[PDB]
């Protein structure tokens, strides 16, 4: 499992793999880990499949009622706080690593990272899951300050391809998502569409 | 499993059942629990089936060499000591046996209780096995030193029978042996189901 969210000027770019494993067998090789909560708010799921899906549906219910009551478009900080309150209160029962990234008309593009502990912090980029541990060196070296939308799509796709290459728990297909004022646009990079990196041979 | 042996005026009576179990399932009801060591010595099977069969056969081997070297039969006390010494070297390793060595000696009728733990004691009456506690009850109430030969058969045969009735691990057929001065003789191999109809009438 490898999840990624990078923030740019107009909004955010999200990316995730599609492999979910139960031991050494792949139960689903084409899992959608990018769950929509609202119109412009998305989250990334990693860890226990039963836990991540149950919390995501709960926040959608909580923010959905919150948005109508206030009669305003929901904030990304508000959606991330609802994930924070559930992951911290039931930290001994839940095994989840949620990265919440979206857009609101007040602040703009935001990336929040909520790991297993239950803490919440805003970041420029956020990586999570088992396969993320293999791309900490790449992301830190390649990340440039002030990247455009199209550059962030390439930045996320390359980092996920390198993570899926080495990690056994990660693999399958790359799912991308771009959120701005215009709306949400998603694309899937298939088997031949994946950025190929050369294999070391003598 | 129920094996018993007692000595009296005329000789030594050896009695055993034939039920062998692998947990709750009964593997066999026809096992020869009275191990024929020599034409003059007898043993019993309790606990481990292979442990009783292998070591007493090693004893049967050792007793024959003793007879060839010394030109005389081995004493019951010496036959009990040899088996006690061999199994003692493997104490606390995994061996499990509870045998009774019977035979007529120069001193008279002999009875010894040998364990895998290392016990070796001589007495007038013994009972080994899971149903040994039930065998002691009916045996002690009808025991006498001046008991008749036919009266001795009825005591031991019923003592196994009463044990098979209460113990789940005991059953099959009651095997009876009489030990005399010239040698032991095979008395009877009565089935428990056949004896049930006999004691009812």
């Amino acid at each position: 499992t490898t999840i990624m969210a990078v923030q740019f000027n107009g909004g955010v770019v999200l990316g995730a793999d599609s492999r979910t494993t139960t031991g050494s067998y792949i139960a689903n090789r084409v899992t959608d880990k990018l769950t929509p909560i609202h119109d412009h708010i998305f989250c990334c799921r990693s860890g226990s499949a039963a836990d991540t899906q149950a919390v995501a549906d709960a926040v959608t219910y909580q923010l959905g009622f919150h948005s109508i009551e206030l009669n305003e478009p929901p904030l990304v900080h508000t959606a991330a706080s609802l994930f924070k309150e559930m992951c911290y209160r039931y930290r001994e029962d839940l095994m989840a690593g949620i990265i919440i990234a979206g857009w609101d008309p007040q602040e703009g593009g935001q990336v929040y990272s909520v790991p297993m502990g239950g803490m919440m912090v805003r970041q420029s980029f956020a990586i999570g899951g088992s396969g993320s541990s293999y791309i900490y060196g790449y992301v830190d070296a390649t990340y440039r300050e002030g990247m455009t939308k199209d550059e962030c799509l390439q930045f996320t796709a390359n980092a996920l391809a390198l993570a899926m290459e080495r990690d056994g728990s990660s693999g399958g297909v790359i799912r991308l998502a771009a959120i701005q004022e215009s709306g949400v646009e998603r694309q899937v990079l298939l088997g031949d569409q994946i950025p190929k990196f050369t294999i070391a041979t003598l | 499993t129920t094996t018993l042996a007692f000595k009296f005026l005329h000789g030594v009576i050896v009695a055993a059942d034939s039920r062998a179990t692998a947990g709750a399932y009964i593997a066999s009801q026809t096992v020869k629990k009275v191990i024929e060591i020599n034409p003059y010595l007898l043993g019993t099977m309790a606990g481990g089936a292979a442990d009783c069969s292998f070591w007493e056969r090693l004893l049967a081997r050792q007793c024959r060499i003793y007879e060839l070297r010394n030109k005389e039969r081995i004493s019951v006390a010496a036959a009990s000591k040899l088996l006690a010494n061999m199994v003692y070297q493997y104490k606390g390793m995994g061996l499990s046996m509870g045998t009774m060595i019977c035979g007529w000696d120069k001193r008279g009728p002999g009875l010894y209780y040998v364990d895998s733990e290392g016990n070796r004691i001589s007495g007038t009456a013994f009972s080994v096995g899971s149903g040994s506690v039930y065998a002691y009850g009916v045996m002690d109430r009808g025991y006498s030193y001046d008991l008749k030969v036919e009266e001795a058969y009825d005591l031991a045969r019923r003592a196994i029978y009463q044990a098979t009735y209460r113990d789940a691990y005991s059953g099959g057929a009651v095997n009876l042996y009489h030990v005399r001065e010239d040698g032991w003789i095979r008395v009877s191999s009565d089935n428990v189901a056949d004896l049930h109809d006999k004691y009812s009438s």
Binding site: - | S28, T30, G48, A49, A50, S53, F54, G94
Partner: protein, 213 residues
């Protein structure tokens, strides 16, 4: 850590007669929930008067048979004699007990003919305890075949039966019947049944199909 043993299934059956000896087993070899092969007979012939059947851990079964085959020649070279069914049964007892504290996960049944000509069947446990009996079932479906053998071959629980002597025709039919019933209930038993017949003439083999599931 590490487990040296593995349950491979398989059930071996043997019936002794007046002049015949039958050793039969299923050909299924499995592990856990998957089947390794559908053609793996547990019956193996040693001499012209002895056939052995091994069930349990196949690693021990395959090795032990090679020990017996090596010991069969050692007796043949030294004594100038073919090893009798009673001698092999006594020999296997010592080989199994030599590994007392590290035992073979094996259930052996030897079926053959004695010096007189009658059918002889010997039963073995993992450690080496053995006895002679008319019939014995060992393996995974051993608890399914035995009660039927006690009733039909031993004539137990039946009130007024004439006690008919065992013929090869009747015994072969009884072997085929119980394995059909065993394949329905026991998952380790199935695929194909192989029967070995030991007579005055020699050893003969027969194969009967079973449930493939």
């Amino acid at each position: 850590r590490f487990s040296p043993y593995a349950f491979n299934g398989g059930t071996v059956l043997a019936i002794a007669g007046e002049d015949f000896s039958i050793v039969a087993s299923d050909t299924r070899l499995s592990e856990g929930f998957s089947i390794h092969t559908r053609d793996s007979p547990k019956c193996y012939k040693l001499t012209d008067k002895t056939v052995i059947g091994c069930s349990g851990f196949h690693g021990d079964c395959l090795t032990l048979t090679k020990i017996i085959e090596a010991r069969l020649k050692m007796y043949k070279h030294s004594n100038n004699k073919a090893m009798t069914t009673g001698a092999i049964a006594a020999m296997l007892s010592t080989i199994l007990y030599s590994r007392r504290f590290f035992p073979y996960y094996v259930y052996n049944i030897i079926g053959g003919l004695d010096e007189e000509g009658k059918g002889a069947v010997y039963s073995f446990d993992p450690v080496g305890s053995y006895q002679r009996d008319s019939f014995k079932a060992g393996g995974s479906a051993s608890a399914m075949l035995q009660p039927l053998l006690d009733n039909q071959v031993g004539f137990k629980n039946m009130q007024n039966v004439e006690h008919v002597p065992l013929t090869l025709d009747r015994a072969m039919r009884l072997v085929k019947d119980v394995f059909i019933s065993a394949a329905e209930r026991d998952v380790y038993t199935g695929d194909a049944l192989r029967i070995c017949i030991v007579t005055k003439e020699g050893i003969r083999e027969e194969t009967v199909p079973l449930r493939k599931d």
